[PDB]
Amino acid sequence: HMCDAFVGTWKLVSSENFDDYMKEVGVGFATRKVAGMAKPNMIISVNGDVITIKSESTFKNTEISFILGQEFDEVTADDRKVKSTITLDGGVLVHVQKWDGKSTTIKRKREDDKLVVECVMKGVTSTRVYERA
Numbered sequence: 598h599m600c601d602a603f604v605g606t607w608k609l610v611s612s613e614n615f616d617d618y619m620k621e622v623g624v625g626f627a628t629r630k631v632a633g634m635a636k637p638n639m640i641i642s643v644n645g646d647v648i649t650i651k652s653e654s655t656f657k658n659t660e661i662s663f664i665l666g667q668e669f670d671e672v673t674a675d676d677r678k679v680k681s682t683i684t685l686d687g688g689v690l691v692h693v694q695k696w697d698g699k700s701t702t703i704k705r706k707r708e709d710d711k712l713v714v715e716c717v718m719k720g721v722t723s724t725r726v727y728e729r730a
């Protein structure tokens with residue numbers, strides 16, 4: 598029942614500070630503009646020990662599959678090649694991405710009927726709120 602509170606189909610309803618987060622990450626101007634417009638559908642599923650997160654949007658379609666605690670290689674929507682580890686900490690999915698001696702952490706939590714995504718890169722935080730599709 599791992600991650601049951603997260604499983605389903607979710608749609609972005611609000612974003613704050615995302616352009617600033619993307620700039621801290623190193624995303625270039627054109628990508629930031631187009632990516633910042635996107636309203637993704639996020640699909641989270643669980644099959645045994647394997648979690649799959651898909652993000653579908655007019656910007657990019659991305660999919661990751663992983664086992665908690667077990668590092669994987671991820672190519673991000675903005676084309677970084679990162680090493681990612683996702684863990685469940687106190688009911689929060691914590692996703693750390695490492696590349697070029699940089700790190701960013703994305704946390705996904707359930708709050709009321711929403712799924713709240715917090716993206717942090719050095720001092721800059723963005724909050725993205727999803728509701729059930």
Ligand SMILES: O=C(O)c1cccc(COc2ccccc2-c2ccccc2)c1
Nearest residue numbers: 619624632635637652674675703714725
């Ligand atoms: O809202 C999310 O599910 C979420 C989760 C985890 C991480 C991030 C951050 O991802 C991005 C990072 C850099 C540049 C662009 C993106 C990006 C922009 C639009 C759709 C998908 C990725 C968004």
